[model samples]
Target: GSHMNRFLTSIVAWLRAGYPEGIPPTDSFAVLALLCRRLSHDEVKAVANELMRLGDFDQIDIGVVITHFTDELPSPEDVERVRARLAAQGWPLDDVRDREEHA
Candidate 1:
């Protein structure tokens, strides 16, 4: 399901949402893997930390491979019950704290 068209469309949407001032139309354009996303050192660190939580963070230098993990899928009632319980509680859930912050 992951295809270039979806990715390209996503990039376009991101651009439109972030920078409505469309990128200047031009023919002479060059991009590099590092330069492609010019994120600051802190931003890079934050993203790296978040990414490690969701998947692979240890293999940054070794390779571009990433691992994905999924737990047993629960039922709708399970989800609703948890949501209702959380709504009544006055506590910070450690689950989110422990889970990857997400990219």
Candidate 2:
């Protein structure tokens, strides 16, 4: 119940973007799948890696369609999933890795 509250607004927006909302787990999955389809390559990498970063402010994992085999590296599908999750998180996905590398 509370777990999904954080995504209410986002889920609603995504729904308007052209998606059918189902029940629990399914509702979540619907969003993830669409996110992936609408996301880009670079943004995918950030969402996948940044959220899992050692110490990040907003750490969110939106069950996109990626598997995390390595700790930092983003696989093909992983990046794809990451891109969507980032989109779902908010924004059209931008590259901010330069700041991370410097830090």
Candidate 3:
């Protein structure tokens, strides 16, 4: 279970690297939804909470925000949209690809 924390930390680090200017609010849902592919709802909430703490965005309702994605898996088109957006932002998608290979 602790390994989960390490994994989540790496994800946050990756996000930080990819979005040096910070993740825009418009893409926050997409980002969290992508994570739901690998992380449990509670884990996703942990990530969301951590991100909020990092950004000092404590006012948001994490559960309410997470509910959107938990209700339904993102469609393939939505996934592609997020992928394209991250790629355009200079995120190292190769790292994610590599991790998926081993995951």
Candidate 4:
């Protein structure tokens, strides 16, 4: 049931291979960048151990694990909260206007 779309598949592949393009400010996938920051090595190891306990490598898709990190993206409410905080700090989220317009 590999429902992964092309973009998700590419992100998964890049992550599994240790993310070659690690230089900041590069065009490398932002989602993977956040994932690397969010997950510690110990956490990855723990998930690996858990999956190994369940089945062999062929029986599992490690990419699926990485794919799920897409959920870590800021939810609409999270974005709204951050926008409010930025407004409070006197920093205008003017770009948000374009996003809302497009939406």
Which candidate leads the pack in lDDT?
A: 3
Worst 10 residues of 4 by lDDT: 23-32
Which residue segments of model 3 deviate by more than 4 Å?
A: 56-59, 69-81, 85-103
Q: Which ten contiguous residues of candidate 3 have the minimum total lDDT?
A: 94-103
How large is the C-alpha RMSD of every model relative to the true structure? 19.1, 13.6, 5.7, 14.1
| lDDT of model 4, residue 31 | 27
The lDDT-based order of candidates, best leading, equals 3, 2, 4, 1
As a whole number from 0 to 100, the lDDT of residue 45 in candidate 2 is 44
Model 2, C-alpha of 77: deviation from truth (Å):
23
Better of 1 and 3 by TM-score: 3
- In model 4, which regions exceed 4 Å deviation? 1-35, 56-103
Positional deviation of residue 51's Cα in model 2 after best superposition, in angstroms: 12
lDDT of 3 by residue, 1-103 (tens): 3675677777677655556666555456666666666666688787778877887333355556676544554345565666666665455434454454432
> Can you write out model 2's per-residue Cα lDDT over 1-103, one digit (the tens) per residue?
4665445444344433432222133333333444455554334444434433523212345434333323443344544544454455444323454455532
Q: lDDT of each model, Cα atoms only? A: 0.31, 0.40, 0.62, 0.37
Q: Model 1 over residues 1-103: C-alpha lDDT tens digits?
A: 6685564344334323322332221100110122123533344444444433434223242111112211442234444443443334322222245565553
